[PDB]
Amino acid sequence: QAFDDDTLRFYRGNATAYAERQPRSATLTKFLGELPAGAKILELGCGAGYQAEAMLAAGFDVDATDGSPELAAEASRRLGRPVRTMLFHQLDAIDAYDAVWAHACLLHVPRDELADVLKLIWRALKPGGLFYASYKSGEGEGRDKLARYYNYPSEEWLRARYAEAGTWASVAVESSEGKGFDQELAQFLHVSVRKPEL
Numbered sequence: 001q002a003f004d005d006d007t008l009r010f011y012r013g014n015a016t017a018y019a020e021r022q023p024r025s026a027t028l029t030k031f032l033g034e035l036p037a038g039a040k041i042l043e044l045g046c047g048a049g050y051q052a053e054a055m056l057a058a059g060f061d062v063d064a065t066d067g068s069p070e071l072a073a074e075a076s077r078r079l080g081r082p083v084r085t086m087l088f089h090q091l092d093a094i095d096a097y098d099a100v101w102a103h104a105c106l107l108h109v110p111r112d113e114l115a116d117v118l119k120l121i122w123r124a125l126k127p128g129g130l131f132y133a134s135y136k137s138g139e140g141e142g143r144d145k146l147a148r149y150y151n152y153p154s155e156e157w158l159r160a161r162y163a164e165a166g167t168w169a170s171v172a173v174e175s176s177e178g179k180g181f182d183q184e185l186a187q188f189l190h191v192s193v194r195k196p197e198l
């Protein structure tokens with residue numbers, strides 16, 4: 001399957017504690033700066049909704065979603081708006097979003113299913129749309145002490161999967177250094193791609 005059960009089970013049993021941590025906004029600010037005001041944005045794996053809240057306040061039309069009903073519930077309370085429950089592989093929209101934001105969530109997709117998920121995102125994006133996704137880098141898939149699955153890919157592996165998923169007009173990648181929820185130091189790869197213009 002395109003999702004890991006124990007990963008989702010972790011978020012559904014630790015939603016209160018996890019909802020207390022706010023993600024860094026550096027890459028979000030850069031992302032929004034590359035979009036027109038009021039852009040239509042789909043957020044995948046929105047978690048507690050901190051970033052969806054920021055995007056909405058910034059004037060964007062955000063369709064926030066998360067695979068965990070528990071976290072989606074927390075996000076809906078924070079946003080005062082509907083945060084729907086949706087697993088990545090359930091996406092089936094076509095040319096509906098100017099951009100897609102997926103912060104530290106597609107890293108939970110089983111390696112063999114990532115390309116297919118990226119293809120769904122390609123289809124959901126409008127021509128010329130921007131898609132950002134961050135991943136925890138590594139040299140092989142694994143699972144942390146909290147039972148969360150990570151695809152732990154290299155930039156080269158990610159680029160190969162993105163190329164198989166579809167034709168991208170451009171692919172930009174930058175890295176950052178930060179501590180994960182498990183308090184372990186980790187490197188994150190931020191992939192920003194553009195869907196070809198009409």
Ligand SMILES: C[S@@+](CC[C@H](N)C(=O)[O-])C[C@H]1O[C@@H](n2cnc3c(N)ncnc32)[C@H](O)[C@@H]1O
Pocket residue numbers: 002003004007008011022023044045046047048066067068071086087088089102103104105106108
């Ligand atoms: C590390 S959290 C990041 C939440 C957020 N974007 C942030 O940076 O705070 C990983 C997110 O991916 C979501 N999740 C895990 N598996 C997923 C799946 N297969 N479909 C969609 N959501 C999923 C989890 O519920 C969780 O909210």
